Amino acid sequence: MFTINAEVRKEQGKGASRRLRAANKFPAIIYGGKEAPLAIELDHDKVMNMQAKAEFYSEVLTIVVDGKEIKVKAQDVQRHPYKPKLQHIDFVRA
Amino acid sequence: MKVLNSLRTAKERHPDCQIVKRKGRLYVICKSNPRFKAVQGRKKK
Amino acid sequence: AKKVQAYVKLQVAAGMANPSPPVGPALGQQGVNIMEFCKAFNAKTDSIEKGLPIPVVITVYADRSFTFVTKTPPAAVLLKKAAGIKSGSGKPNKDKVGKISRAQLQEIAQTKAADMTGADIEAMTRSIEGTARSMGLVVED
Amino acid sequence: MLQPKRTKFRKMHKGRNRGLAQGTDVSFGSFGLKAVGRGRLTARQIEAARRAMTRAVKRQGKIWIRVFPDKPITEKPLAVRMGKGKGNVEYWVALIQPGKVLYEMDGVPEELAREAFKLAAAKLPIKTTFVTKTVM
RNA sequence: AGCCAGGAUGUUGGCUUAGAAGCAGCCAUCAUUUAAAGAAAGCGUAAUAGCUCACUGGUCGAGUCGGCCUGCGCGGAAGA
Ligand SMILES: [Mg+2]
Numbered sequence: 001m002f003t004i005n006a007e008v009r010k011e012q013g014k015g016a017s018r019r020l021r022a023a024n025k026f027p028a029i030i031y032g033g034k035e036a037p038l039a040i041e042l043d044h045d046k047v048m049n050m051q052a053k054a055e056f057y058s059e060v061l062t063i064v065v066d067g068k069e070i071k072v073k074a075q076d077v078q079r080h081p082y083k084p085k086l087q088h089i090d091f092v093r094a
Numbered sequence: 095m096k097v098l099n100s101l102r103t104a105k106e107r108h109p110d111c112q113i114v115k116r117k118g119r120l121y122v123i124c125k126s127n128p129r130f131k132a133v134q135g136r137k138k139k
Numbered sequence: 140a141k142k143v144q145a146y147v148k149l150q151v152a153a154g155m156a157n158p159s160p161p162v163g164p165a166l167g168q169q170g171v172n173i174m175e176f177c178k179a180f181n182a183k184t185d186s187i188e189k190g191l192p193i194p195v196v197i198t199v200y201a202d203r204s205f206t207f208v209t210k211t212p213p214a215a216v217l218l219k220k221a222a223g224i225k226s227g228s229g230k231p232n233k234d235k236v237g238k239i240s241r242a243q244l245q246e247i248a249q250t251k252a253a254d255m256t257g258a259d260i261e262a263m264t265r266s267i268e269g270t271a272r273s274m275g276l277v278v279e280d
Numbered sequence: 281m282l283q284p285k286r287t288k289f290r291k292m293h294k295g296r297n298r299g300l301a302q303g304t305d306v307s308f309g310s311f312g313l314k315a316v317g318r319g320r321l322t323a324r325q326i327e328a329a330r331r332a333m334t335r336a337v338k339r340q341g342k343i344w345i346r347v348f349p350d351k352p353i354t355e356k357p358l359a360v361r362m363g364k365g366k367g368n369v370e371y372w373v374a375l376i377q378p379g380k381v382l383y384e385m386d387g388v389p390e391e392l393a394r395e396a397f398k399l400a401a402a403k404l405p406i407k408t409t410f411v412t413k414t415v416m
Numbered sequence: 417a418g419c420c421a422g423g424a425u426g427u428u429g430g431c432u433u434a435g436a437a438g439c440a441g442c443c444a445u446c447a448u449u450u451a452a453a454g455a456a457a458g459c460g461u462a463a464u465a466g467c468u469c470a471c472u473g474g475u476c477g478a479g480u481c482g483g484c485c486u487g488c489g490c491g492g493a494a495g496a
């Protein structure tokens with residue numbers, strides 16, 4: 001139902017992540033089960049609004065990366081220390 | 095009128111209180127109950 | 140119905156006629172008689188009972204006196220000598236003071252041939268329930 | 281007025297106050313008052329602000345104070361040479377880093393907590409912002 | 417937004433103090449006629465009050481409201 005669009009990260013680490021967030025994007029991660037974690041990048045404004053409805057944190061969301069669909073549930077979130085912003089999210093494959 | 099570096103309050107002391115930017119200061123007008131006027135500033139130097 | 144022409148309310152109980160300590164000074168002077176507060180006042184008071192306060196309409200174009208015809212007694216005046224106590228709200232809602240009943244006041248309220256709200260003798264009647272509440276009694280309906 | 285009941289040592293090196301806050305979510309109440317600046321809250325500041333929010337709600341609902349001033353602050357008075365020993369403890373602060381939840385509150389309408397946190401905010405030397413409980 | 421309207425009845429509200437008729441303070445915050453109309457919003461007060469609004473009917477006729485991330489600026493700013 002909630003549909004999130006992501007690209008795989010081509011970089012990693014602090015510099016890259018700080019640069020991602022400077023670009024109104026933000027890093028996230030997909031893990032769980034047999035497959036390997038998938039480092040991804042999400043649109044900040046789009047996901048901010050989604051996660052502002054409690055439904056988000058309990059329903060199965062679908063992330064789209066190269067037209068492939070990953071079914072996940074939100075698992076953890078790191079928020080900005082004092083702004084209405086997101087720094088990072090854990091998703092676990094549901 | 096009174097001065098004030100803040101109108102948050104003096105703007106709502108009454109229904110006809112307005113807030114205006116005459117010259118380059120902010121005045122709180124209220125031409126019915128004048129005692130409620132204010133400004134934020136006080137001239138050039 | 141038309142506009143504003145003399146009309147004021149302020150007495151205490153109808154089994155009197157003009158008393159001094161309540162109002163004395165202030166009860167008529169734009170052609171209205173203090174002294175006259177009798178002939179008209181008891182123009183329908185004696186003919187039924189003395190002890191329900193009924194105030195009532197003035198009327199003065201530019202006259203030296205007034206007429207008015209009266210209407211029905213209040214509602215609050217039906218919670219001291221007919222249903223429960225007099226201390227009023229007493230302490231309106233710390234305890235429930237006293238109580239009324241469904242029977243009480245429905246009949247008495249239901250004799251109003253010139254005041255209330257609603258064509259349903261029940262809707263108007265249900266409204267009367269609210270006043271009894273203003274002074275914190277109990278519902279036994 | 282808050283103060284440690286007893287401590288291991290009377291006095292404490294000045295130290296520094298870099299870093300981000302810990303304890304950053306509304307973890308007890310429904311709403312919170314959150315720190316945006318870096319700095320010091322005095323025991324009296326916590327109090328001036330605590331009274332106001334408690335005035336503001338007519339002692340309804342419930343209030344939590346998430347900070348505590350466990351840092352002793354000394355001062356040297358007038359007419360004193362430098363040195364000749366460390367000043368005397370005069371007051372207590374809690375060190376605040378951006379993000380510290382300072383006060384939480386619940387049992388009141390969102391509208392009223394904001395008024396109350398707004399009233400306290402006027403008593404503190406650091407910028408703050410209004411926050412809400414969050415699932416996750 | 418503006419302007420035309422209305423803003424009625426239990427109820428002159430019982431009652432805490434010397435008035436009280438929302439007319440101060442504490443208590444509650446019910447209820448009817450409806451198009452809506454608060455046992456009130458705050459000016460005012462000998463009691464009335466006689467104001468307006470909260471809320472709704474009309475008129476106009478296409479936008480309007482104020483929170484969020486952020487850029488540059490405004491006021492805050494008086495000395496020999
Ligand atoms: Mg670096």
Ligand SMILES: [Mg+2]
Nearest residue numbers: 116117118119
């Ligand atoms: Mg000029």
Ligand SMILES: [Mg+2]
Nearest residue numbers: 417418475476
């Ligand atoms: Mg309009």
